[PDB]
Motif scaffolding. Sequence first.
Motif, mmCIF file in Angstrom:
data_model
loop_
_atom_site.group_PDB
_atom_site.id
_atom_site.type_symbol
_atom_site.label_atom_id
_atom_site.label_comp_id
_atom_site.label_asym_id
_atom_site.label_seq_id
_atom_site.Cartn_x
_atom_site.Cartn_y
_atom_site.Cartn_z
ATOM 1 N N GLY A 93 0.857 -1.221 0.000
ATOM 2 C CA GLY A 93 0.000 0.000 0.000
ATOM 3 C C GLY A 93 0.879 1.253 0.000
ATOM 4 N N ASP A 94 0.333 2.372 0.399
ATOM 5 C CA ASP A 94 1.135 3.628 0.417
ATOM 6 C C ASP A 94 0.778 4.459 1.654
ATOM 7 O OD1 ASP A 94 2.933 5.423 -0.377
ATOM 8 O OD2 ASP A 94 1.662 6.444 -1.785
ATOM 9 N N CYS A 95 -0.481 4.750 1.852
ATOM 10 C CA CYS A 95 -0.876 5.565 3.039
ATOM 11 C C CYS A 95 -0.540 4.803 4.324
ATOM 12 C CB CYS A 95 -2.378 5.871 2.985
ATOM 13 S SG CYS A 95 -3.333 4.390 3.405
ATOM 14 N N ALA A 113 -6.298 4.251 5.690
ATOM 15 C CA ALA A 113 -7.081 3.803 4.505
ATOM 16 C C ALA A 113 -7.496 5.024 3.683
ATOM 17 C CB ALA A 113 -8.329 3.052 4.972
ATOM 18 N N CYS A 143 -5.650 5.637 0.520
ATOM 19 C CA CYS A 143 -5.165 5.404 -0.869
ATOM 20 C C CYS A 143 -5.797 4.125 -1.428
ATOM 21 C CB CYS A 143 -3.628 5.291 -0.867
ATOM 22 S SG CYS A 143 -3.100 3.597 -0.482
ATOM 23 N N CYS A 174 -3.012 -0.195 -2.292
ATOM 24 C CA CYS A 174 -2.915 -1.483 -1.550
ATOM 25 C C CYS A 174 -3.995 -2.457 -2.032
ATOM 26 C CB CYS A 174 -3.033 -1.232 -0.047
ATOM 27 S SG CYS A 174 -4.691 -0.656 0.378
ATOM 28 N N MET A 208 -13.574 3.193 -0.790
ATOM 29 C CA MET A 208 -12.346 3.770 -1.408
ATOM 30 C C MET A 208 -11.604 2.675 -2.173
ATOM 31 S SD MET A 208 -9.978 3.729 1.914
ATOM 32 C CE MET A 208 -8.714 3.387 0.666
ATOM 33 N N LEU A 236 -7.323 -4.229 1.453
ATOM 34 C CA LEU A 236 -6.377 -3.098 1.632
ATOM 35 C C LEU A 236 -5.195 -3.587 2.468
ATOM 36 C CD1 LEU A 236 -9.401 -1.521 1.547
ATOM 37 C CD2 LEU A 236 -7.740 0.342 1.623
ATOM 38 N N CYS A 260 -3.329 -2.346 4.065
ATOM 39 C CA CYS A 260 -3.280 -1.593 5.351
ATOM 40 C C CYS A 260 -4.467 -1.981 6.238
ATOM 41 C CB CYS A 260 -3.342 -0.092 5.067
ATOM 42 S SG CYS A 260 -4.902 0.299 4.239
#
Length: 106
Positions: free
Chosen positions: A37-39, A43, A45, A48, A70, A84, A86
């Motif tokens: 993922g990135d953020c 949650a 982005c 992920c 999202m 996700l 994350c």
Amino acid sequence: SKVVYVSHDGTRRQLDVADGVSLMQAAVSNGIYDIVGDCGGSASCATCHVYVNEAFTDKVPAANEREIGMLECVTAELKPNSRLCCQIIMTPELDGIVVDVPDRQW
Ligand code: FES
């Protein structure tokens, strides 16, 4: 337990997610930080969009569609197996889980 990530092309890096961690946490070092993922645990982005196996996404929590909103407009397509990165932890219950990479990488 064990955790191996895959890529939409096959590239998969294996690693060991301690108990009480998220494939994202182990990613910061394992290198999936780039293939994850990135953020982060957050949650916000949609990068992920990992595609997990069908026997490892069960032990994980059952994130309703709330966080899916999202993750529903992600840059790819999603299925009940996607999750996700994350929002999933690899406890001692799951072992040798197979996570995959979205069709794209945002
Ligand atoms: S890592 Fe950003 S929404 Fe999952």
